[PDB]
Amino acid sequence: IANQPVVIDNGSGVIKAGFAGDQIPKYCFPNYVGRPKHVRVMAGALEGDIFIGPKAEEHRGLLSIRYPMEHGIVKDWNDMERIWQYVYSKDQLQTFSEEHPVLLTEAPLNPRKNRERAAEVFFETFNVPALFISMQAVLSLYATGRTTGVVLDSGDGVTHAVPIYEGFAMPHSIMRIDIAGRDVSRFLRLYLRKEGYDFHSSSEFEIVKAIKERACYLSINPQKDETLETEKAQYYLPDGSTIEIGPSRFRAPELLFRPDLIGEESEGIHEVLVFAIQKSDMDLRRTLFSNIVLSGGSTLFKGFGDRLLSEVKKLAPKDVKIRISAPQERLYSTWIGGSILASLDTFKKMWVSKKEYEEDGARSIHRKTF
């Protein structure tokens, strides 16, 4: 088709949208629906009961935030419909959905009902020519330009590791855990209350996410840094008031490596990676350990690469070469992969047409996705 296909990386924290061929996503805005909690009395105030993306970011204090998708599962579909509608609206790409085909990027081992409804909305509500659902990991490999690699994609909603050797991805060796960036922000809020600073409000929870991104380092030794008296590093809030974070700075992001802290019986991010490699056949283990690709925004933590390389080495066999490779644009790596896949002529065969979807139904989407 002559019209370029639109890449939409439906991420839990940030949804990144743009046209195929573009080197970077032009229009990336936070994934939440902002509704005004205070009453409108005056004439000329902000119009509409729905605020999405940059308008919501500016007038955040006025609005009550509500995330539509949690742990890579769309909880409220009405809200998910409004954000996808906003992508096609005048503020972002500003084109008709009927003329451009779509590339949606869901997480691996998500419920089948999610993929079915995602297709139903994108074919019925928007009359799109073609939709292809793809895994986040498979795209991240196209971006770096490498056929062999395990992709540890620590997103806002979900953290998953997919071992992919010479194009083929091993579906039984896929490891997924719900504990991710948003649970670290939730666990940080709990520890900030213990320190004696309350952030009850949905708008105030976005300030806790800002504190996490700015000031939180992963210590190389957890038990060592716990005992030592820490320098109480002050952070300036939007209003102006100063908070001393203290021990909560380094204890919060450790959740990713130890899910026992929040109290979930799951594998740590370090355990996820090695289990994914160890589950793969004996021959490929050495090549997968050598080729590790970090992805997602939750890998950008200070001393993540240093800690992971320490933790993987202990669990992994002795005298094995462990090289962890980070693309400079970790956050946008998933989308860039989508753009490269979309630009290829092979993508035309991969698509599910409207007529193809209309005839078979839900089955056609499940058949052609991985």
Binding site: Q23, Y142, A143, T144, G145, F168, Y217, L294, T299, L300, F301, K302, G303, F304, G305, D306, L308, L309, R323, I324, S325, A326, P327, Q328, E329, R330, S333, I336, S339, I340, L341, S343, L344, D345, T346, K349, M350, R363, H366, R367, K368, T369, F370
Partner: protein, 75 residues
């Protein structure tokens, strides 16, 4: 100005505005991880002439007729 000159109970020889004095990545530079530069133009060229075989494709959890491998071959 002439509007407020008419009314009796108005502020005269007072400043209108009372205001204060106008006051004027760490992980992405780590040794452990190997920093790769993403060039999509270079990447696009490497995969340019690579095709996939969508004939007899079925990734779904369908038991019938042994194991399946999606995307058979190119050209």
């Amino acid at each position: 100005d002439p509007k407020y000159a008419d009314l009796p109970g108005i502020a005269r020889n007072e400043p209108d505005v009372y205001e204060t004095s106008d006051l004027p990545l760490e992980e992405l530079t780590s040794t452990s991880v190997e920093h790769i530069i993403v060039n999509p133009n270079a990447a696009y060229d490497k995969f340019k002439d690579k095709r996939v075989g969508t004939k007899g494709l079925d990734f779904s959890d369908r038991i019938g007729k042994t194991k399946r491998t999606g995307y058979e071959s190119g050209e």
